[PDB]
Short mmCIF file of C-alpha atoms (C1' of nucleotides) in Angstrom, two decimals:
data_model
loop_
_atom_site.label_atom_id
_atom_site.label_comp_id
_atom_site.label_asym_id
_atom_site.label_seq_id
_atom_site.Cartn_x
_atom_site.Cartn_y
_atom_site.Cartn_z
CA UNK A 1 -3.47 20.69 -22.15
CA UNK A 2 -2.39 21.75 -18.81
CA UNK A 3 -0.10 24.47 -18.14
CA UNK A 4 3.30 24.01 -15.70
CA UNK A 5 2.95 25.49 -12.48
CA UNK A 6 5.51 27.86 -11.64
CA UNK A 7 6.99 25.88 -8.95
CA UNK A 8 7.61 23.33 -11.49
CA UNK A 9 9.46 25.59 -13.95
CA UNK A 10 11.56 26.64 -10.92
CA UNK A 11 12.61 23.25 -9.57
CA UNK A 12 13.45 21.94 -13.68
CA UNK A 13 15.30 25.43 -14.60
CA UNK A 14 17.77 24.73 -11.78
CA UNK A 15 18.04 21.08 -12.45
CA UNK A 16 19.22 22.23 -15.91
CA UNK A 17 21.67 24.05 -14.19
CA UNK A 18 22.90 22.52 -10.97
CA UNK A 19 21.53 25.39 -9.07
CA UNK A 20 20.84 24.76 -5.34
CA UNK A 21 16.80 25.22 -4.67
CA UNK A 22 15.25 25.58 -1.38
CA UNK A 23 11.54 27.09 -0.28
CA UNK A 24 10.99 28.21 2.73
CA UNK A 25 8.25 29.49 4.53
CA UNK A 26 9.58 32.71 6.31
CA UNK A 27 6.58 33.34 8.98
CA UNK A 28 3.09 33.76 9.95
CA UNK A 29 0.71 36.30 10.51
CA UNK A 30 -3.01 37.04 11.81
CA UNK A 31 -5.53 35.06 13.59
CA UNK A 32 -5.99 31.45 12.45
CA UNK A 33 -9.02 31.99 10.36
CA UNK A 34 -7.20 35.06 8.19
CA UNK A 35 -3.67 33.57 8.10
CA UNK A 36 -1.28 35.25 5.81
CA UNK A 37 1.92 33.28 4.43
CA UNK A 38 5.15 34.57 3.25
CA UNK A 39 7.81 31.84 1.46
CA UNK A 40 10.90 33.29 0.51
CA UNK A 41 13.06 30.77 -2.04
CA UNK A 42 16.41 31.24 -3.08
CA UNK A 43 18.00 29.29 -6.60
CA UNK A 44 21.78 29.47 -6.09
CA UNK A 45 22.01 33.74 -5.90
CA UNK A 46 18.78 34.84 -6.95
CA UNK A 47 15.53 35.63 -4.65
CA UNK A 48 11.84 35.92 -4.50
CA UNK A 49 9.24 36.40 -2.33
CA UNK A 50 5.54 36.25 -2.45
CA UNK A 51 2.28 36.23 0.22
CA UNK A 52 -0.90 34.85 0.15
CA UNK A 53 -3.66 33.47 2.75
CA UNK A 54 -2.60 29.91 2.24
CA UNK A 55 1.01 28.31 2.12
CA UNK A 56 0.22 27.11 -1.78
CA UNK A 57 -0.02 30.53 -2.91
CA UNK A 58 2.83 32.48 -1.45
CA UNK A 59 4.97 29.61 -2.84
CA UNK A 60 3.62 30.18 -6.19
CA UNK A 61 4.31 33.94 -6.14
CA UNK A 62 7.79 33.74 -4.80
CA UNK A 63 7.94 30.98 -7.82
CA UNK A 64 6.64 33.61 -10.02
CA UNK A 65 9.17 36.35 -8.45
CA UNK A 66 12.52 34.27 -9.20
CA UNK A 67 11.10 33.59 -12.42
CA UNK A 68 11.06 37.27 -13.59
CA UNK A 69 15.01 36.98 -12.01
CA UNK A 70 15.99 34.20 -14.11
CA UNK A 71 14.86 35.40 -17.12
CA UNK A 72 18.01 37.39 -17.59
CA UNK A 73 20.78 34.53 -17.68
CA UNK A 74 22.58 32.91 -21.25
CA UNK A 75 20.51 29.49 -22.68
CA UNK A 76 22.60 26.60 -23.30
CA UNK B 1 21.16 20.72 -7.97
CA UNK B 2 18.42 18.28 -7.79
CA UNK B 3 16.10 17.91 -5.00
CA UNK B 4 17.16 17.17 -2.11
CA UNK B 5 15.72 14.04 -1.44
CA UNK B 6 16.46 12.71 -4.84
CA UNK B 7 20.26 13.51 -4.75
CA UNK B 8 20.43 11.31 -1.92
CA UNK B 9 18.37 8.67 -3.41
CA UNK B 10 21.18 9.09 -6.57
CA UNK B 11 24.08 9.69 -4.54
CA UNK B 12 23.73 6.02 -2.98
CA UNK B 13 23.62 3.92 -5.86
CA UNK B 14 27.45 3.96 -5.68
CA UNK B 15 27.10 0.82 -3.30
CA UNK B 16 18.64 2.85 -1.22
CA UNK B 17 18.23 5.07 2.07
CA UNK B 18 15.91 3.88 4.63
CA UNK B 19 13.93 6.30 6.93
CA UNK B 20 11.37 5.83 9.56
CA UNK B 21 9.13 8.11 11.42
CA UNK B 22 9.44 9.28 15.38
CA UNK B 23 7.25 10.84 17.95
CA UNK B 24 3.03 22.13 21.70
CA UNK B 25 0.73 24.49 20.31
CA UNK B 26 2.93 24.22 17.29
CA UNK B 27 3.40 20.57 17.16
CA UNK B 28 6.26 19.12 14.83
CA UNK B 29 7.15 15.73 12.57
CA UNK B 30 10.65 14.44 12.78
CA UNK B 31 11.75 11.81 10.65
CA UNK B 32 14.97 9.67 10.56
CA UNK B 33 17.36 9.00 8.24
CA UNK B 34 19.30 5.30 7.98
CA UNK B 35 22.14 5.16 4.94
CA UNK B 36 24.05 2.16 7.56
CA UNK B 37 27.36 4.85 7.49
CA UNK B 38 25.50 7.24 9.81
CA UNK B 39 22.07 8.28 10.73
CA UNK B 40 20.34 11.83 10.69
CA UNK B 41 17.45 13.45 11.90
CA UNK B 42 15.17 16.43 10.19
CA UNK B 43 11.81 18.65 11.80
CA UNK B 44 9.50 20.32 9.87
CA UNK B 45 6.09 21.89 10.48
CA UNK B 46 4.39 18.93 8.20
CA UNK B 47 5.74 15.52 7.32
CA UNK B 48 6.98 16.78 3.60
CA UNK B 49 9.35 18.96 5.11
CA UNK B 50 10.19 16.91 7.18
CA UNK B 51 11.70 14.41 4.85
CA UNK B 52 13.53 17.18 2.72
CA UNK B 53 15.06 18.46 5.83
CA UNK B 54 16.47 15.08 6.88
CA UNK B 55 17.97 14.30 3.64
CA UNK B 56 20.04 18.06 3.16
CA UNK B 57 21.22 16.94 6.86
CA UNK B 58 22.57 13.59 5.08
CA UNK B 59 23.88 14.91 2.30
CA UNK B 60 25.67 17.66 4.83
CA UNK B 61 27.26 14.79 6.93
CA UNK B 62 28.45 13.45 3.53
CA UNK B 63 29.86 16.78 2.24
CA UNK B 64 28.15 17.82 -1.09
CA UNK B 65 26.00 20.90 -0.24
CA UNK C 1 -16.61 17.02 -9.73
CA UNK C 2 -14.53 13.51 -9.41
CA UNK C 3 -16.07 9.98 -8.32
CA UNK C 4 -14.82 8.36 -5.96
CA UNK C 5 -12.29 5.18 -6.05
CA UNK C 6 -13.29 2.03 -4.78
CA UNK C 7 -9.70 2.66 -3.02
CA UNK C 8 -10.60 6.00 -1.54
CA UNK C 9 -14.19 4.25 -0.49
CA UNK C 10 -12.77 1.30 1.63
CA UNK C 11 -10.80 4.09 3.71
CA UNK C 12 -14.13 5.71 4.72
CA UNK C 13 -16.39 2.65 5.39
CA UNK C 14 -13.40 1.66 7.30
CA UNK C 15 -12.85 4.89 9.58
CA UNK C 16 -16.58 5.04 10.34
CA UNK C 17 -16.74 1.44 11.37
CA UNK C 18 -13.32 1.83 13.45
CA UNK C 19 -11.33 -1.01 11.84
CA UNK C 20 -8.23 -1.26 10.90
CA UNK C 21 -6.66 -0.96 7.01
CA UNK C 22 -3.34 -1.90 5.31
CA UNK C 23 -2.87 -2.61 1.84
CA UNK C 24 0.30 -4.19 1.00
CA UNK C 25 1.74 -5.49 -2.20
CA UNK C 26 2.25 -9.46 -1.87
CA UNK C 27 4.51 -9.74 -4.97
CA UNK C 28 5.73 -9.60 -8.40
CA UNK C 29 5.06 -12.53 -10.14
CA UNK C 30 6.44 -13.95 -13.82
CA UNK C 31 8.75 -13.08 -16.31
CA UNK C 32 10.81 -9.67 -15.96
CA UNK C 33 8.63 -9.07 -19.10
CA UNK C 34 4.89 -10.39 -18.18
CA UNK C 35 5.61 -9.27 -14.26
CA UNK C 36 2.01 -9.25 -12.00
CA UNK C 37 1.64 -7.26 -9.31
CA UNK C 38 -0.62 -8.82 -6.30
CA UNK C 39 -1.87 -6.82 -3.46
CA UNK C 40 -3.69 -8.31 -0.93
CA UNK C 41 -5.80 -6.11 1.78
CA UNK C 42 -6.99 -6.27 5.31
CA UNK C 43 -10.16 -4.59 6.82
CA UNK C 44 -10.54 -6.63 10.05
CA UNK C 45 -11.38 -9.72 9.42
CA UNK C 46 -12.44 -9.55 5.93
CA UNK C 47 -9.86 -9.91 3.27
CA UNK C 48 -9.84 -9.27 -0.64
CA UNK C 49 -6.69 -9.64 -3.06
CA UNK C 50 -6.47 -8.17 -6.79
CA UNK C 51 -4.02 -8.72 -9.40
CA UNK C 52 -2.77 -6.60 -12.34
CA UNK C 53 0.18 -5.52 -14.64
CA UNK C 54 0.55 -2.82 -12.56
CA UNK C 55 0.88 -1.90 -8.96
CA UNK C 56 -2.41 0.90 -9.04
CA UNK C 57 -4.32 -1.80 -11.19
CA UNK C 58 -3.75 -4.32 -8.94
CA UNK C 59 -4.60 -2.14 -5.50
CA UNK C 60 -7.89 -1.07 -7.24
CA UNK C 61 -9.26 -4.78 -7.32
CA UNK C 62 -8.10 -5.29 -3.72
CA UNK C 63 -10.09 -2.94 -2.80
CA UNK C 64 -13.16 -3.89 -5.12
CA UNK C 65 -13.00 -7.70 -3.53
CA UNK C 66 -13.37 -5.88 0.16
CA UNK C 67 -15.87 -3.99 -0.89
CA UNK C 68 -18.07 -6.53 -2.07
CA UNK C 69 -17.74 -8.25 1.31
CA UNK C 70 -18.22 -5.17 3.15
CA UNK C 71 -21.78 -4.72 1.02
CA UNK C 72 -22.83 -7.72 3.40
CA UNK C 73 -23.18 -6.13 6.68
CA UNK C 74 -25.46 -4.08 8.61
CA UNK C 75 -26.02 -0.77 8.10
CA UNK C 76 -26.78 0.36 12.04
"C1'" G D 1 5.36 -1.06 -21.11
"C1'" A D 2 6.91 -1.50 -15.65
"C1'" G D 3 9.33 0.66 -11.06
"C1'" G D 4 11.29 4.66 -8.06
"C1'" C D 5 11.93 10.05 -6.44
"C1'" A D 6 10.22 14.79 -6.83
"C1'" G D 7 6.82 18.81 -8.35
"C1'" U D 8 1.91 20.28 -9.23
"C1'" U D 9 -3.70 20.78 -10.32
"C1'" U D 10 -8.44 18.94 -9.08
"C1'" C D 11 -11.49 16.10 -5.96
"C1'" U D 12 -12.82 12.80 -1.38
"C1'" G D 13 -12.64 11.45 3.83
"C1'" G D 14 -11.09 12.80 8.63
"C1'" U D 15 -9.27 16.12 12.17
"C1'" A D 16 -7.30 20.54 14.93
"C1'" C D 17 -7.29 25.88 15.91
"C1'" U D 18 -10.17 30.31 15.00
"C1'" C D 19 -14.31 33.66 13.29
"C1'" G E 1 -21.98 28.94 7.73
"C1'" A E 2 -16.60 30.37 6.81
"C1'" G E 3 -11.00 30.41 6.92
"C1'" U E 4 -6.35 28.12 7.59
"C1'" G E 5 -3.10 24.17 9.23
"C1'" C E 6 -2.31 18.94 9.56
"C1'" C E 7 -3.25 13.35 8.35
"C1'" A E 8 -5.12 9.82 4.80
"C1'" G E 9 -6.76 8.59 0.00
"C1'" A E 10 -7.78 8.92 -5.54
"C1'" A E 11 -7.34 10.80 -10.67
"C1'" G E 12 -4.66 13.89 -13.95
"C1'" C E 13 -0.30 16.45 -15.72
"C1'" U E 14 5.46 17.70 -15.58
"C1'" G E 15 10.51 16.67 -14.52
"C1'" C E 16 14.60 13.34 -13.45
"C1'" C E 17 16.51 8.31 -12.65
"C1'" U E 18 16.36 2.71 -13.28
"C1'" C E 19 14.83 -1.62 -16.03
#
RNA sequence: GAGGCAGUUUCUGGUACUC
RNA sequence: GAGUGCCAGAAGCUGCCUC
């Protein structure tokens, strides 16, 4: 019905694997009314980025980021 | 591995962590942390952070992370 | 396009009227099987309790029993 | 079936800063 | 009229844990 955010996928891929997870909101820019986010994340070694004009989206594209990065490991 | 907010909430069941809420143009939450071995503090720039922040400072003054 | 709860409503009758709220579960009651959850509400001086098999049940007719109370007052 | 923690989508109310 | 932050609230969905 309902797809999985990317930020979900994240947090559950690196439950799977003990990997440490932690967003972060990196900084600020612009006036208040055209605000632009960056969150950087890191899950154990790997890295992503993203941007966006509200704090939801940047985390979803640094979500989407790490996800091309951990597409590359062995399954179970 | 787990969130962490969780792994403390998992990590205590050996013997339930208690926290409570204290009092600029960029104005700040800070929120406590009480496990009765030691207490901890955390900031954050909204009260979800806030709460993540003072548990990875728990589970540093406990040794895992 | 969402209704709204009779939870969410007793929040902004409340804040417009400048009274306090606090919903608070009273107890679990019965067998570990047949357990009922009671929550019991205060809006000022009116009052309204609700019981269910769960705790969100259970909230939701607090705050109906309020609101019925709060259907007899002035307008102004 | 119930409880907890987390994540997320949508919607509601309020508020602050700015155009 | 608009943007973003923050607080509160509701419904849905996912993950993990307990009974």
């Amino acid at each position: 019905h309902m797809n999985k955010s990317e930020i979900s996928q994240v947090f559950e891929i690196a439950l799977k694997r003990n990997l440490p997870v932690n967003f972060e909101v990196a900084r600020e820019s612009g006036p208040p009314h055209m605000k632009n986010f960056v969150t950087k994340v890191s899950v154990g070694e790997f890295v992503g980025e993203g941007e966006g004009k509200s704090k939801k989206i940047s985390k979803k594209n640094a979500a989407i980021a790490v996800l091309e990065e951990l597409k590359k490991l062995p399954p179970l | 591995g787990i969130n962490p907010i969780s792994r403390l909430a998992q990590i205590q069941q050996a013997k339930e962590p208690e926290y409570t809420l204290l009092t600029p143009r960029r104005r700040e939450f800070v929120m406590q942390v009480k496990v009765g071995n030691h207490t901890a503090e955390g900031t954050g720039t909204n009260k979800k952070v806030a709460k993540r922040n003072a548990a990875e400072n728990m589970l540093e003054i406990l040794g895992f992370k």
